[PDB]
Design a protein around this ligand. Structure first.
Ligand SMILES: Cn1cc(Cl)c2cccc(NS(=O)(=O)N3Cc4ccc(CN)cc4C3)c21
Length: 505
């Protein structure tokens, strides 16, 4: 993901494209003052165009283009579909040649600030064979150091060790005292990852996994939120975003012509390997097996389905899915309407009423209002088959703000606690459905929080959580799960709040 430049101003971006790019060169960058605002800067005709990309929490919105689940998916889409991006005039803007960043600050293995003993101590306590990091040399400013652990993963017996390797910076290029000079640390690290260094006496300094500092015991969260609150949240979030290059899995079924009008947004699509497949379709319907939805399985375990708000033409498919998967609990993440725009289409009957949605039949038995949500008790059955009836409990969250995130996580936490006890009380209930909007932002945020508090509920303080690792695992099952830095911070705040209420228990 070299085309993303975290610490660049607009005028710096222009100068890079004009002096080191050509027509078709391009890069993306953030605004520093306005989080969630991004810019795509592109060269055309020896001049530079800047195109804004907005994320309020639900998707990336490219002005003059489409909506996307990640910046990597945006770039992949426009590098394979020419003529497709246009300016105000309507003229064509081509993304041909990514302009690569050399700044290493968003790489998992970069820990600029560490000293040698502090790096030895981290690798000693937290690392295993092949754990590595790169830090700035203290004794030679501008130079860097590579620290690596190697040995037997079975007390302090002498079967393992840390080694250090010095990295010179000479005329803006990096080397290990011999061989090739590299244009950046990334290229040097990538090269020795594939072709590790060997000491004369045989030891192979294998670079297998970056040092892990985000795995922590649950009673540490309080002091870690404090550290991260003093732009650390930004750094850690952006480090996670630079891993999304690894999650470009295929979405071919969602691109079929037969399926185009089943998607809220044409390029926000379900991965093929985790999509929910519908069986028992009307035999006439050429393609009856598609819904924009994915199974989320955390890696007596709870699983989820993350999905979009219905289209008026996908309401029947939504009920086919709930029935087939045996789901007994639904969470809605938005109002029907926000800012005068449809965010989650009504797909249930009015209170006390009964409606048929194709082959499925739903009764709305009772609504109950709470402060932050409405609960609707629904009864779902197949038409013509009496005792297929099951209760489905629909939890509609109603107080999420239109932009950003709640200022207090208590409401969300009290909501998931109730949703969790309902699910546990029903024997053999299927996955919990979580949906509305495009089903990636709020939906990802609710699911991740739920996974993390589950661990803490079953274990207690004596449990390791790892927030960015957990999100990466859920982003491998649906595109773009958790959209913003505000949502990312919200998840840490929710975990902190949950711990501090049980620590009063
Ligand atoms: C463990 N894990 C797995 C995935 Cl995928 C992932 C993505 C991002 C972050 C971490 N955690 S980490 O311990 O590797 N990590 C914290 C952090 C914070 C700042 C920097 C400076 N760029 C570097 C690092 C390294 C991840």
């Amino acid at each position: 993901r070299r085309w993303f430049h975290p610490n660049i101003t607009g005028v710096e971006a222009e100068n890079l494209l004009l002096t080191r790019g050509v027509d078709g060169s391009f890069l993306a960058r953030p605004s520093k003052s306005n989080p969630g605002d991004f810019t795509l800067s592109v060269r055309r005709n020896g001049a530079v165009t800047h195109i804004k990309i907005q994320n309020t929490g639900d998707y990336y919105d490219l002005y003059g283009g489409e909506k996307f689940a990640t910046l990597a998916e945006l770039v992949q889409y426009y590098m394979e579909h020419h003529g497709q991006l246009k300016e105000k005039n309507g003229d064509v803007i081509e993304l041909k040649y990514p302009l690569n960043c050399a700044d290493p600050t968003s790489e998992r293995w970069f820990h600029g600030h560490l000293s040698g003993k502090e790096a030895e101590k981290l690798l000693t306590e937290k690392g295993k064979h092949g754990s590595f990091l790169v830090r700035e040399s203290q004794s030679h400013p501008g130079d860097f150091v590579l620290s690596v652990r190697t040995g037997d993963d079975k007390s302090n017996d002498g079967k393992s060790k840390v080694t250090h390797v010095m990295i010179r910076c000479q005329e803006l290029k990096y080397d290990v005292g011999g061989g090739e000079r590299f244009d950046s640390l990334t290229d040097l690290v990538e090269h020795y990852k594939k072709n590790p260094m060997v000491e004369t006496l045989g030891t192979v300094l294998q670079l297998k996994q970056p040092l892990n500092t985000t795995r922590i015991n649950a009673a540490e969260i309080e002091s870690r939120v404090r550290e991260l609150s003093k732009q650390g949240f930004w750094e850690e979030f952006e480090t996670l975003q630079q891993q999304e290059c690894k999650l470009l899995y295929s979405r071919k079924e969602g691109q079929r012509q037969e399926n185009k009008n089943k998607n809220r947004y044409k390029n926000i699509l379900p991965f093929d390997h985790t999509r929910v497949v519908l069986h028992d379709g009307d035999p006439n319907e050429p393609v009856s097996d598609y819904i924009n939805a994915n199974i989320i399985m955390p890696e007596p375990k709870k699983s989820y389905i993350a999905t979009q708000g219905c289209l008026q033409n996908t309401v029947n498919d939504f009920w086919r899915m709930v029935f087939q998967e045996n789901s007994r609990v639904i969470v809605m993440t938005t109002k029907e309407v926000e800012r005068g725009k449809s965010k989650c289409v009504k797909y249930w009957p009015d209170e006390y009423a009964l409606k048929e949605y194709g082959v499925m039949r739903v009764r709305n038995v009772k609504e109950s209002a709470a402060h932050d949500y409405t609960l609707r008790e629904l009864k779902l059955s197949k038409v013509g088959q009496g005792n297929t009836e099951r209760t489905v409990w629909q939890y509609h969250f109603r107080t999420w703000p239109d932009h950003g995130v709640p200022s207090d996580p208590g409401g969300v936490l009290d909501f998931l606690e109730e949703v969790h006890h309902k699910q546990e009380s029903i024997m053999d209930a299927g996955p919990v459905v979580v949906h509305c909007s495009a089903g990636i932002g709020r939906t990802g945020t609710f699911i991740v929080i739920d996974i993390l508090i589950d661990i803490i509920r079953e274990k207690g303080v004596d449990c390791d959580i790892d927030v960015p690792k957990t999100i990466q695992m859920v982003r491998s099952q649906r595109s773009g799960m958790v959209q913003t830095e505000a949502q990312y911070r919200f998840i840490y705040m929710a975990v902190q709040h949950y711990i501090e209420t049980l620590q009063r228990r």
